[PDB]
C-alpha cells in the first residue's frame, strides 16, 4: 500500500526499490505574445528516478522536442514518464530490476501500472510523504546537464556522493531530504549556506561539497534553522 511514516525504514532494506518523481518532466515559462495573449514555451525537463538505499540516480533528460505537435502535455508527461521508467527497468538485468517502484504523485500510478503490465511482480506504490524531490533542479550540476541537452539523454549520478563510506543509507537519505527541503523553501539562503566557505570545494565527480563530519553537522543545523525560520517568515511566528 501507501508509503508513510509508519513504514519508513522499508526504504533501506535489501529489496531493490526506486522512487520516481515526475515534477520536473514538463517545464514551461509563461509569457505574453505580441498580441498581448499568453503562451507557454517548454524548457528541458527530467525524470528523477532514485534508489534510496544506494543513492543511484537514473536522470532521464526530457528534451523539449518530445512535446512538439503534442496536445494535453501535462497528461502526456505522466505517460512519457511511465514509458521511460518501463524502458529503464527493461534495460536492467533481472537481478537489478526493482521489486517496488514508489511514485511521489498519485497521478503517476495508473500510467506506470499500465506501462508495467509485463512486470506483474513489481509493486507500484504511492506515498503519503511530501518529499522535496522537485528541488533536484536546484542542484547546480543537475540543472546544468538538463539545460545543455540537445537530445534525449540518460545521465547516471550518485546523489549521496561518497557519503555511504561514512554513514548509513538511512542517514544519507535524511541528509538529502533536509538539503532538498531547504533548497525548496529558500533556494538562495540554502545555497549561501552550502558555499559560503571558499575552502570547501565540490569534487569534479560530486554534486555537493566535501564537508567533514563536523562540518556536516554544522551545515545540517543551519539548514534546519532555515526551514524553521522560513516557516516563521511565512506564517509569522
Amino acid at each position: 500500500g501507501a508509503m508513510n511514516s509508519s513504514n519508513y525504514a522499508e526504504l533501506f532494506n535489501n529489496d531493490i526499490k526506486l522512487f520516481v518523481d515526475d515534477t520536473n518532466v514538463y517545464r514551461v515559462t509563461v509569457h505574453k505574445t505580441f498580441e498581448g495573449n499568453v503562451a507557454t514555451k517548454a524548457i528541458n525537463g527530467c525524470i528523477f528516478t532514485l534508489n534510496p538505499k544506494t543513492g543511484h540516480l537514473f536522470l532521464k533528460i526530457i528534451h523539449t522536442s518530445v512535446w512538439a505537435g503534442q496536445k494535453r502535455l501535462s497528461q502526456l508527461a505522466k505517460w512519457k514518464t511511465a514509458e521511460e521508467v518501463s524502458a529503464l527497468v527493461r534495460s536492467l538485468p533481472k537481478e537489478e530490476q526493482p521489486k517496488q517502484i514508489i511514485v511521489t504523485r498519485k497521478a503517476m500510478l495508473d500510467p506506470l501500472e499500465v506501462h508495467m503490465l509485463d512486470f506483474p511482480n513489481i509493486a507500484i506504490r504511492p506515498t503519503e510523504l511530501r518529499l522535496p524531490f522537485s528541488a533536484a533542479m536546484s542542484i547546480d550540476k543537475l540543472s546544468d546537464v538538463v539545460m545543455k541537452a540537445t537530445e534525449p539523454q540518460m545521465v547516471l549520478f550518485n546523489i549521496y556522493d561518497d557519503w555511504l563510506d561514512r554513514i548509513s543509507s538511512y542517514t544519507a537519505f535524511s541528509r538529502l531530504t533536509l538539503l532538498l527541503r531547504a533548497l525548496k523553501t529558500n533556494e538562495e539562503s540554502a545555497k549561501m549556506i552550502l558555499l559560503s566557505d571558499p575552502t570547501i570545494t565540490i569534487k569534479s565527480y560530486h554534486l555537493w561539497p566535501s564537508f567533514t563530519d563536523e562540518q556536516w553537522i554544522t551545515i545540517e543545523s543551519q539548514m534546519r534553522d532555515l526551514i524553521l525560520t522560513e516557516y516563521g517568515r511565512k506564517y509569522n511566528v
Binding site: 502526456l76 505517460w79 511511465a82 514509458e83 495508473d110 500510467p111 501500472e113 499500465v114 506501462h115 503490465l117 509485463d118
Partner: protein
C-alpha cells in the same frame, strides 16, 4: 401462452415472475403461474418469509420444455424441474387451471417493459454463463460469485461472465499504452466485439443479463459486470452509431425499472458520473441522462 405449475407451496415465500411478485402463505393452495408470454426468456425467483437471506431463482424459456416447481424439504428450496411426459404435463396443468389455482402473468397490453429489458438475452447464452448442462433452465442466487471475482471459490457454481479488466494485457496494446487506456475503442471493437462476443447483440445480452441478476438477486458480481460493460462503451471514442442508440434505450429501461430504494447500492456513482458527464459518450445517452437526472439527481 405457457404455464409453470407448482406441486404445492409448503413454505411461506414471496414469488417473483419477471418484474412481478406476489406473496404466498405457508400451505396456501397455490399451483403455479399461467399465461406466460412465449417468445421471451423469463425468470422465476423466490425469497422465503423466514429467511430473506438468499434470493434465488431460475432463468427459463418455455419453448425449451415443460417446466414445473416443486419444494424440496431436504435442500429447503423451491426447485425447477423438467417434465418429459408431455401428456402428463398437459393433464396436470389443465386440472389446475380448471380449479383456478394459478396466478396469471399480469402483463398490461401497453407494456413493453420485459421485452425492453430482455431484448438481446438468449437462453443459449445464459446457459454458457451459468454452467449446468443437464438442465434446460439456469439457477442463480444472491451469493454466486463471478469467474473474475474468483480470480481476485467453487468453479461449478460460478457466473462465467466475460472478463473485462481495463488494466490488463488484453486491454492494452504494447506501444499504445496511453492511447488504449484513455480511448478503449480497440478493446471494445476489436478484442471484445469482433474477438469475443462476435456482435453487439451478444454483448448487449450479457449486459442485460448482468443487470437483471444484480436487480433481482442483489448479486454483487453481476452489478460489477453491468457497470464494466457500460463503462467500456462510454470510454471508447469510436462506437457504432447504432450501438450508442440502442445502449441509450437499454439503460433507460433498466433505470426506469430499478426500485427507487435500491439505487443507493445498485448504482455506482463513479461509473455513472463519468459516463454521463466526462466520457466520450457524455452527449450520446440523452434518454438515460434525462431519466437519471430526474429520478436520481442525488447520485449525481
Amino acid at each position: 401462452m405457457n404455464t409453470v405449475p407448482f406441486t404445492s407451496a409448503p413454505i411461506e415465500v414471496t414469488i417473483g415472475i419477471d418484474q412481478y411478485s406476489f406473496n404466498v402463505k405457508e400451505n396456501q393452495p397455490f399451483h403455479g403461474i399461467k399465461d406466460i408470454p412465449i417468445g421471451h426468456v423469463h425468470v422465476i425467483h423466490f425469497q422465503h418469509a423466514d429467511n430473506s437471506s438468499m434470493r434465488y431463482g431460475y432463468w427459463f424459456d418455455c419453448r425449451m420444455g415443460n417446466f414445473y416447481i416443486q419444494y424440496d424439504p431436504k435442500d429447503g428450496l423451491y426447485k425447477m424441474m423438467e417434465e418429459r411426459d408431455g401428456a402428463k404435463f398437459e393433464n396436470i396443468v389443465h386440472n389446475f387451471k380448471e380449479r383456478q389455482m394459478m396466478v396469471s402473468y399480469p402483463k398490461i397490453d401497453e407494456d413493453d417493459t420485459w421485452y425492453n429489458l430482455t431484448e438481446f438475452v438468449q437462453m443459449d447464452k445464459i446457459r454458457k454463463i451459468v454452467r449446468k448442462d443437464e438442465n434446460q433452465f439456469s439457477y442463480v442466487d444472491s451469493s454466486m460469485t463471478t469467474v473474475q471475482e474468483n480470480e481476485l471459490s467453487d468453479p461449478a457454481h460460478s457466473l462465467n461472465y466475460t472478463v473485462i479488466n481495463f488494466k490488463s494485457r488484453e486491454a492494452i496494446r504494447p506501444g499504445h499504452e496511453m492511447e488504449d487506456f484513455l480511448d478503449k475503442s480497440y478493446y471494445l471493437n476489436t478484442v471484445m466485439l469482433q474477438g469475443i462476443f462476435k456482435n453487439s447483440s451478444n454483448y448487449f445480452g450479457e449486459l442485460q443479463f448482468a443487470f437483471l441478476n444484480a436487480m433481482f438477486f442483489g448479486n454483487y458480481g453481476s452489478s460489477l459486470q453491468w457497470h464494466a460493460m457500460i463503462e467500456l462503451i462510454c470510454s471508447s471514442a469510436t462506437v457504432p452509431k447504432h450501438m450508442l442508440d440502442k445502449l441509450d434505450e437499454i439503460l433507460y429501461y433498466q433505470i426506469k425499472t430499478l426500485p427507487e430504494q435500491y439505487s443507493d447500492i445498485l448504482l455506482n456513482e463513479r461509473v455513472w458520473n463519468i459516463c454521463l458527464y466526462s466520457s466520450f459518450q457524455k452527449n450520446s445517452l440523452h434518454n438515460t441522462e434525462k431519466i437519471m437526472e430526474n429520478k436520481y439527481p442525488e447520485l449525481l
